[model samples]
Target chain A: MDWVVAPISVPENGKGPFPQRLNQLKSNKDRDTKIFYSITGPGADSPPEGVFAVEKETGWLLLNKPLDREEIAKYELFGHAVSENGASVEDPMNISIIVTDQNDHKPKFTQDTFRGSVLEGVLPGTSVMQVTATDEDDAIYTYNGVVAYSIHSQEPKDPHDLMFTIHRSTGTISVISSGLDREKVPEYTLTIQATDMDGDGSTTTAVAVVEILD
Target chain B: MDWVVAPISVPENGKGPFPQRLNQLKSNKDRDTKIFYSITGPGADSPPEGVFAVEKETGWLLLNKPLDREEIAKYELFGHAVSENGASVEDPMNISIIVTDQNDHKPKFTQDTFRGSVLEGVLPGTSVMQVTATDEDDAIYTYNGVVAYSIHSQEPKDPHDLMFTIHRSTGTISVISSGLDREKVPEYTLTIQATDMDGDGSTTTAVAVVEILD
Candidate 1:
């Protein structure tokens, strides 16, 4: 018998009305004889049971409950086709399922606050300090975990338009203006923001204190 | 930070132009700071690596290959969100997936042929023989398995209009017309058909021998 080469992939945490129709099972000989459908193994009759079930008359596979990929990633199931007289009509079928991925977490900062110091009269393009943040989401996703950096706000707005700039890809903070004067401003408080999803996704902020040294 | 409760789901055997978008990962801080998304574990960097992937800039999760549910039912992966400065932005998110089912197999019969006897002049409803068929498809669907029986044809079409009938549910064949005559027709060869999808699905046929007994 030609078996199914590709398996079914369902999303975890399915938003359903319950008892969703996952798939259907059939036999080529169904037209000539009476056949029965059954399933066994983990997630069915064993541990973590009933999460997956089949209708004996219809051979419809059903999703009984919402699934958590973290708890269980994959399920191994066995399918059976039998005659009304308790005879195996076909060899047992291997039912394999691979839960896909989802983005459920947001980007976060490693530290709530970062402190850095820059010398007085610093020239433009002088590197100050780098502030970092991270997300514990799926590493394979760009929007879910990748982070970009920017200066959210400057406490005590300097006479110059912008005093600090953060790298979008490297999170490096540098002097974008040459207006650093120890006597003019004692210190500057910068609100560093980290964003995911090309700067359009979730975001988190941290504190950066830049003190000009004499 | 607000969390995403709903998970992403990807269908197995996707008929796609390769590299399909499965989901998008995001961070609340993305509006200000830039974030990157990534995934690791079983389907990404492990044994079945490259199946699940993400775009760093967009946090878009992608499916690189068609999946087979019978081989693997679910996948467990970790999600990460980070800032440009190599710091953790948020706690890791758990990614989950559940593979659904499909109708791939057809109903089949246990025996190639069935034999039974009925006395001559038997009542119209006298039971002749029962034939069985089964499907290996998912049991939760109605159009995949549910086998229905019918009498395709009788070798010797007696002068009587219809001679035999089969039960749609039980696959039982019985005399429908008073055409049972041992001397006139010693035996009858019947083609029993079993069909799924309520008699419109894949079908298979079996031969039945009905001997008219004195």
Candidate 2:
């Protein structure tokens, strides 16, 4: 008696880099039969970014991103079949495509300077202010922070006399110099450096200005 | 008492993506108090594909794909700082970013045809042969099959006596004509179609050829 097999369904249009495609074929046999597929047409050489390969035993195709029309053009998926010894007998096979999504987005800053103010007559070593930012990738990549900071501006012509230092790691801006007479400089303009790299005393820098009021 | 936090290292050249820069800040936090990150640049709207947001509390950043020089330009990540309630105080927060990779690949098929042959003069309704093909996306979209057969070439057209009938679902080939004299037509050329869809009278087709010898 001739045995019949059912076809498989895969996502038609996908926007990859898809990690994997979830599609399956149904069969009743217990023997281990090898499956085959003939993927031809244009754009096969370079499928979308994450479309790595198609499984042989199972009819699953993986993409790097979600299914999109432009990316689907890379494939001219014809048909699928099965055989015992990798040789063609008269067997039936079908295939489908499924595309999935991934979190491949980067984080960003809101502005160039995070400006704020403090009391003019405050003593040195006081906590003046803080900074903030956000990211939108998936849970894995999104939860992690990707920004750092430094002190780009300070008062006084002498770098040493200015006596203001930013905590490289905590981003804590404190006054290292003693004896601040609000009369000399009511406000201070600081070039705060914001970097994605761990604020390891080094990295890119941003600017922040602090206005001190009595 | 005043606590001074200093970064162990700093990012140079400012050429890496945001995730890398954020990593720098997170590393710095190991020595000092908690470092906070804020947006002071282009914000998340324009971040590169492989970068993501920093954690609200941990100051960690993430990257989707591997970082390269091409992505360096898109990010003008300056620095990070600590602030109190959206205000830049003396101590600004610090942040950092990191990148990681994952496994995302599927299988594929290399060849289109799986060929074979059989002898002519076989009894009618006998199993002539079978053909198979496969795919390598994943086990999901693998191989399913429905076989089809047709006579691509016929030798003797005298009474239009010979006709080829194939089991649409089973891929079985049989002789429809009862008057078959192998002496007249020594060889029969048949075309077979296979598909990944259900091979039970409802599936797409992939074609191959077979030759019958006496």
Candidate 3:
């Protein structure tokens, strides 16, 4: 029977404590087959080597060094299992080492600013194009990779702070208050922030240019 | 503590014995936790709901229905674990159901027809605009989703059949036989095919029109 690694996932606990415990790889072998492991990929050998190490006797995989989601996010390693004589026991396996999210990277948007339009006489809560920012954080790492949306700054502050409201989870900006006049405020420039670690972590900003229509 | 399904990958196994087994979920808590699982997203409540179902008490996931990579390739499901009182024990976890390629989708080109110009007296392997085709098969699935690009037919069939050649994997087309004169032939029309499952699976075809210039 061929060997298979079922459910391969290693956490980003590599913010080390030196080397961190990851997973024990398993496979089918004789009672005395004696399996040794080797990894080949980015951070494996030549330069950025030793980020991952395996026990010579046991197939336990390790995160031998710290990983940065910013510097290097995922490691695609080819894991080989061999016996003492160096004869191939199993074909080299492709193991993906997904670096878990830390609050190390800020959110980013593709463009510096975005522009969209809405009719002036639209109803309250009418739609304006949503501005979006992206973060490569692991979505499941609590708020570490999960980004939350908010308004970093906006211009022309009236006595009231009402111009638009953004959906807290999904990045959607909708008109909150209604007014039917294009002669006065024909344009709105709002700066939006996308923050990781919920609202308490590192943040990034973008400008949304809104053009009011007739 | 948070519950996670690490390195989530499910193969689209169509090699039947219909209804294949996928995975069994795990948690840090004991049996007394009495966890109930619910998946909310596409293919959950629809006619294809039976495609992916979890066990009531055991929390095992199964693929009960066949999947097509053509219409919807992957599903984004929110896995919610709740106590008997209907309060969430853990925040909803986002799990992706990736549909592995099944050789069901033919590769399609960005355009139905292509046009490119190459000088008649240029180098043997001169430049001709490349052709591209998109397939839904998982590249890692070997022949299942992997496509082999080939020339199905070419105009002006010579006795030995030599004129142009294409990269089997990259879809690059170039002159195989050189010394062309625009006076003899002004153009060449090539029909290319993108086939899945090596040459045994489904295939899609497109026309490439190459103009020979001075």
Minimal lDDT window, size 10, model 3 chain B: B1-10
Per-prediction CA RMSD (Å): 29.1, 30.8, 22.6
Where does model 1 exceed 4 Å of error? A1-4, A29-33, A40-42, A45-47, A69-74, A83-89, A121-123, A139-142, B1-214
Residues A1-214, model 2: lDDT tens digits: 0101112223332223446643333333424565453333233244433344445656444344444322442233333344556564333433223221121222344556777777755787887777543333222232213455566667554425565677754666777766554566666777666543233111344566676666
lDDT of 1 by residue, A26-122 (tens): 7767887888888898999999989999888788878898776657878988888888898988787777776643333457877888889999787
Q: DockQ numbers for every candidate?
A: 0.02, 0.01, 0.02
lDDT for each residue of candidate 3 in A22-112, tens digit (9 for 90 to 100): 5665546535677666667777774587877766666667776656666676778776777788766767766766543433456786678
**Residue A129 shift from truth in candidate 3, angstroms:** 67
User: For candidate 2, what is the DockQ-based docking class?
Assistant: incorrect
Once fitted onto the true fold, the runs of candidate 3 whose alpha carbons sit more than 4 angstroms away are A1-214, B1-8, B13-21, B24-51, B58-64, B69-98, B110-112, B140-145, B157-160, B197-201
Best-fitting candidate, scored by lDDT: 1
Give the 10-residue window scoring lowest on summed lDDT in candidate 2 chain A.
A1-10
Model 2, C-alpha of B133: deviation from truth (Å): 48
Candidate 2 chain B: worst 10 consecutive residues by lDDT? B1-10
**What are the Cα lDDT values of the candidates?**
0.73, 0.40, 0.64
Interface RMSD of each: 20.7, 27.7, 18.0
